[PDB]
Amino acid sequence: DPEVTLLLQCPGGGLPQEQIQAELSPAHDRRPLPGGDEAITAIWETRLKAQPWLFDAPKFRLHSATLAPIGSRGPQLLLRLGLTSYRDFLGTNWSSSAAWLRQQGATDWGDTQAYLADPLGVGAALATADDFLVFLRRSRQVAEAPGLVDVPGGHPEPQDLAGQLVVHELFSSVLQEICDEVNLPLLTLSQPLLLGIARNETSAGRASAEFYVQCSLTSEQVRKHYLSGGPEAHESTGIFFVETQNVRRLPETEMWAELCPSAKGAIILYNRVQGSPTGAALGSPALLPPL
């Protein structure tokens, strides 16, 4: 799977909100482009003169994420974040020249990402009461990953002493994206656990935080809520469910070639962090069948 790389695998089965610190600093921003940010402004002007209803939005930028020594007390993860925008994404990661910008960043800064917007995504491994994960089908008419399978998620918009409010917005945003697209009541969802961070090498290395969320509704009840919104209540074109039993071997299935990179990252981290038991009971052959 060359189109996804793991940047972070969380310990303890995943981290709760209270164990994460954020540092939001202009030191974590994209570097100005070598020949100037006028190249971004030109791409944006061309796009608005074809689609004048488009609008810019702020985004968080991922610089890096440092895990504490395993088994330690106190905060377990430090997220170093800057600020970026949808406009800067279109002019860098989404540009035909994105690979040239990665090479220039290695040369100038020793950092393949230094010239890339790198907006932070969120995604969820969303489990039902009857032990299935939730999958969504993308429209065949959108620009990114048309017709592919995704999981619930999105790219959160901004608004440890500004830090804790940023971590709160990240955790809040993955629940809001589940309520907006799957049409589930907020009170049927668990507090999220962070499983890790995955990079999309098809989008010049932009990263997504991948979370585990449990729902108190069955697969049948989740399906009814999604469909009862009607076609205008969701961007996806369909919902479907895979038993958690079967997610273990998903990379060996024909479904794997249909998954978009950020959804592949969610399922790899689910299998490594929530699956893959370490104890004698769940690791016994009848409960963890060999192969």
Ligand X SMILES: O=C(c1csnn1)N1CCOCC1
User: Which residues of the chain form contacts with ligand X (CB under 6 A)?
Assistant: 59, 86, 89, 119, 155
Q: Which is nearer to ligand X, 23 or 181 (CB)?
A: 181
Q: Which CB atom, from 75 or from 154, has the smaller least distance to ligand X?
A: 154
* CB closer to ligand X, 138 vs 225: 138
CA separation for the pair 93, 43 (Å, rounded): 12
Does the annotation flag 272 for ligand binding?
A: no
Residue 272: what are its φ and ψ, rounded to 5°?
Answer: -80, -35
CA 179 to chain centre: 16
Question: Closest CB to ligand X among 51 and 278?
Answer: 51
Least distance in angstroms from the C-beta of 207 to ligand X: 11
Q: Nearest to residue 236, comparing CAs of 249, 227, 245, 244?
A: 227
Give the whole-angstrom CA distance, residue 270 versus residue 272.
6
User: Is 245 within 8 Å of 275 (Cβ atoms)?
Assistant: no
Measured from each CB, the residue nearest to ligand X is 155
The closest alpha carbon to 174, from 213, 136, 117, 226, belongs to 213
The residues near 33 (Cβ < 8 Å, ≥ 6 apart) are 39, 40, 92, 101, 115
Flag whether 157 is marked binding.
yes
The SS3 call for residue 54 is coil
- What is the rounded distance in angstroms from the CA atom of residue 54 to the CA atom of residue 141? 17
Tell me whether residue 135 is annotated as binding.
Answer: no
What lies within 8 Å, CB to CB, of 47 at 6+ separation is 54, 90
β-strands 121-127, 206-214: how paired? parallel
- Nearest distance from residue 205's CB to ligand X, in Å? 13
Of 89 and 211, CB closest to ligand X:
89
Instruction: Tell me how far apart the alpha carbons of residues 170 and 276 are, in angstroms, rounded to a whole number.
Output: 26
150 is in an annotated binding site: yes
Q: Rounded to the nearest whole angstrom, what is the least distance from the CB of residue 49 to ligand X in the complex?
A: 18
From the CB of 208, what's the least distance to ligand X, in Å? 10
Q: Which is nearer to ligand X, 102 or 155 (CB)?
A: 155
Q: 86 among the known binding-site residues?
A: yes
Tell me the binding residues for Mg(2+). Answer: 177, 181
Tell me the binding residues. Answer: 55, 86, 138, 143, 150, 155, 157, 177, 181, 262
Tell me the binding residues for substrate. Answer: 55, 86, 138, 143, 150, 155, 157, 262
